């Protein structure tokens, strides 16, 4: 399990692998590790799968209620804070979550880290997961604010590739999403074994 996302000049690039494990046994290789919140927001999967999925689905319901009542879409700073207030109450009961909220609001790009430990921080770059430490090294050596879009695609896929290469627990398919001002669009979906031939 390795997920990363980073802000830059033309929006947010979100990349994720697709391996879910059961101990040493690999259960699946087609896990959709970026959960689609709404036409403008994305959430991420690290740690516990259902713990991520239920709270982000209920957050999508919450922000749709807010769109119906307040007649406007939700900001990142409000929605991620509601996710933090949902997951803060159940500290210490055994929950496991690592998430990134990615959208486009009036502050521009949005990228906030919220977990089941309760942490809530901003930042320009992030990476969460078991093989996340390998993703930081490949990500930060090419990262700057002035990245071009396709070079950002190459940096995201290369960092997830090296993270999947070193981590035994990470793998699957490198899924790549791009949130822009007019909405999020799917970039590509690529197997690791094809990119080993490419790289």
């Amino acid at each position: 399990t390795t997920t990363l996302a980073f802000k830059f000049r033309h929006g947010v690039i979100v990349a994720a692998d697709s391996r879910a494990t059961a101990g040493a046994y690999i259960a699946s290789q087609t896990v959709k590790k970026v959960i689609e919140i709404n036409p403008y927001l994305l959430g991420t999967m690290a740690g516990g799968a259902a713990d991520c999925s239920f709270w982000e689905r209920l957050l999508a319901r919450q922000c749709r209620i807010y769109e119906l009542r307040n007649k406007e879409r939700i900001s990142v700073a409000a929605a991620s804070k509601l996710l933090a207030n949902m997951v803060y109450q159940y500290k210490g009961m055994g929950l496991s979550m690592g998430t990134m909220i990615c959208g486009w609001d009036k502050r521009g790009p949005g990228l906030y880290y919220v977990d089941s430990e309760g942490n809530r921080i901003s930042g320009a770059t992030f990476s969460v997961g078991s093989g996340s430490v390998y993703a930081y090294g490949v990500m930060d050596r090419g990262y700057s604010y002035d990245l071009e879009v396709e070079q950002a695609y190459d940096l995201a896929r290369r960092a997830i590739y090296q993270a999947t290469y070193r981590d035994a627990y990470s793998g699957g398919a490198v899924n790549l999403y791009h949130v822009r001002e007019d909405g999020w669009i799917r970039v590509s979906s690529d197997n690791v074994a094809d990119l080993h031939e490419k790289y």
Binding site: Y25, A49, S53, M93, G94
Partner: protein
């Protein structure tokens, strides 16, 4: 204080086809070193377009289906139609999650047709995450079936192979062969094989024996 689960074994198997879904299961029921019964099917018909597979602790396997048929008949009252396959999956994800901190130790595999006449297999965890697959093995012997289906359905690690679509006559023999392979090596799977094929005409059954030991 009351060790509240017992692993009652069993494997289930679902394959989503082009216009069908096959669901298979053993009927041996175990408890550690004993065989309780040799005819206890794990495939439970929900509606005309969906049959569900159960594996895990048997008491939760009974309780959960007594919940699901009640929820289906509540839906058929309040909405004047039978549920779709995706509606049943989305319902059961909430039902499994609402027991978060004392989970149903059940691995659910929903097989059936969607509204467009294609096969859909929905394989769940005890805590309610779910995903759509083309094929899935679950329960006890999943590690013996799932690499072979990874070979034969996804066509991985094969060069110079034509990726032919999923026909019924090859898939049925695949289900029989993987369960013979599971019964030869896993102690928990055996004594019969109950196969539910969901097509547009209805649901039929075929029974094949396995190893008795």
């Amino acid at each position: 204080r009351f060790s509240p689960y017992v692993f009652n074994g069993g494997t289930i198997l679902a394959i989503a086809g082009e216009d069908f879904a096959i669901v298979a299961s053993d009927t041996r029921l175990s408890e550690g070193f004993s065989i309780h019964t040799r005819d206890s099917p794990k495939c439970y018909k929900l509606t005309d377009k969906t049959v569900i597979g159960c594996s895990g602790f048997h008491g939760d396997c009974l309780t959960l289906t007594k919940i699901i048929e009640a929820r289906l008949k509540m839906y058929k009252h309040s909405n004047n139609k039978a549920m779709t396959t995706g509606a049943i999956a989305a319902m059961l994800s909430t039902i499994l999650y609402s027991r978060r901190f004392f989970p149903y130790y059940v691995y659910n595999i929903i097989g059936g047709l969607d509204e467009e006449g294609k096969g859909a297999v929905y394989s769940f965890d005890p805590v309610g995450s779910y995903q759509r697959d083309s094929f899935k093995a679950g329960g006890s012997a999943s590690a013996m079936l799932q690499p072979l289906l990874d070979n034969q359905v996804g066509f991985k690690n094969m060069q110079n192979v034509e990726h032919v679509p999923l026909s019924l006559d090859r898939a049925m023999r695949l289900v029989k062969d993987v369960f013979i392979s599971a019964a030869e090596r896993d102690v928990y799977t055996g004594d019969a094989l109950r196969i539910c094929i969901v097509t547009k005409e209805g649901i039929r059954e075929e029974t094949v024996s396995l190893r008795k030991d």
